[PDB]
Design a protein around this nucleic acid. Structure first.
Lengths: 102, 22
RNA sequence: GCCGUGCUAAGCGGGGAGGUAGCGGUGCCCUGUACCUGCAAUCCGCUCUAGCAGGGCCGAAUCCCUUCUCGAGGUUCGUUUACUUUAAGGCCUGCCUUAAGUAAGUGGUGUUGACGUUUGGGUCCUGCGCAAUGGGAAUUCAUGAACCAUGUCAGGUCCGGAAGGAAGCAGCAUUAAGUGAAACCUCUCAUGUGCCGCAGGGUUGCCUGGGCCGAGCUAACUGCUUAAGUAACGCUAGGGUAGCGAAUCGACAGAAGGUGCACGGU
């Protein structure tokens, strides 16, 4: 859920240098992908604000988040709307990859 | 095992931040 | 005529009833055995009178005919008596459906006096009226809202060099939305809550039981009595049948009489 997504971005900022993993310790580059470009991010990080605006119910069941709920979340994070819709699509592909492996 | 799980989670978060096509 | 030897006729069962215009037979019955065969029942062969045809036995006669007597039986009509079948006719009789009244057997209830004396319980139907208390709400406490209440909104977010604003989520009140807990105060509907307000139907038409006083009603199942109703089982007419009678035909037994011819001898 979104409470877990923020924790992953929060732990990335906590333990991440030069987008490590990606040879952060040598530091030259260094971006692990290459790359970088960051790769993420000055906007993926905001990702934290969108999940923060959600309720406890909305976080536990993201399938309940529709038009009237989205419009409320966007106004509380000062977003729109395409940036939040991007974060949720990325999270959907993550759980598909998590259940398939470990 | 727990440590491994944590690492995996972190990786997933990083990927999300990067963004990528479906 | 008396004797000897022959032949003919007759005969070799009859009767009753029906039928046929009769007279017969075949058939049915009555008496007996008393020759044979062809015909006879939509009757058939006849019509005087004889069964048609054909054949065998006996012969004038105790064994041929006639008549009286006796009487097995056929038929018909009528009465008294018994049985069977069928139908009217009716309070003899079975039975519908019954009116009135009373007696005993049983229950019961109430009609008269229902006076009068006793009591308990119950009823108990219609209709309206009402409160009760039985249910449904305000109310109250508790709780109580990511996004589309609110109050208070830490922390992230934005505008900005600052002073000051923007978006307003988590959380926590109260209140919407609700939720839970019980009950005064508040609304609403009402059951033996009261029959408390009353009317009508019986205010005694009752329901029930018990102690009672002469009729009563009811089961009128039984008794007596009187009056109605259907028809046959038990009653009356016709038919058949037995003990009765009349009529008319008649087997059988028995009595009285009548029935020929040829030749030879004399």
């Amino acid at each position: 859920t979104l409470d877990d997504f923020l924790e992953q971005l929060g732990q990335v900022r906590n333990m991440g240098p030069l987008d490590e993993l990606l040879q952060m310790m040598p530091g030259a580059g260094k971006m692990k992908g290459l790359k970088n470009i960051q790769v993420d991010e000055k906007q993926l990080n905001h990702v934290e604000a969108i999940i923060k605006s959600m309720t406890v119910l909305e976080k536990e069941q993201p399938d309940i988040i529709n038009a009237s709920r989205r419009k409320r979340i966007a106004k509380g994070s000062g977003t729109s709307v395409q940036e939040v819709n991007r974060l949720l699509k990325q999270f959907d592909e993550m759980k598909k990859m998590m259940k398939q492996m470990t | 095992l727990f440590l491994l799980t944590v690492c995996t989670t972190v990786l997933v978060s990083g990927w999300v931040v990067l963004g990528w096509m479906e």
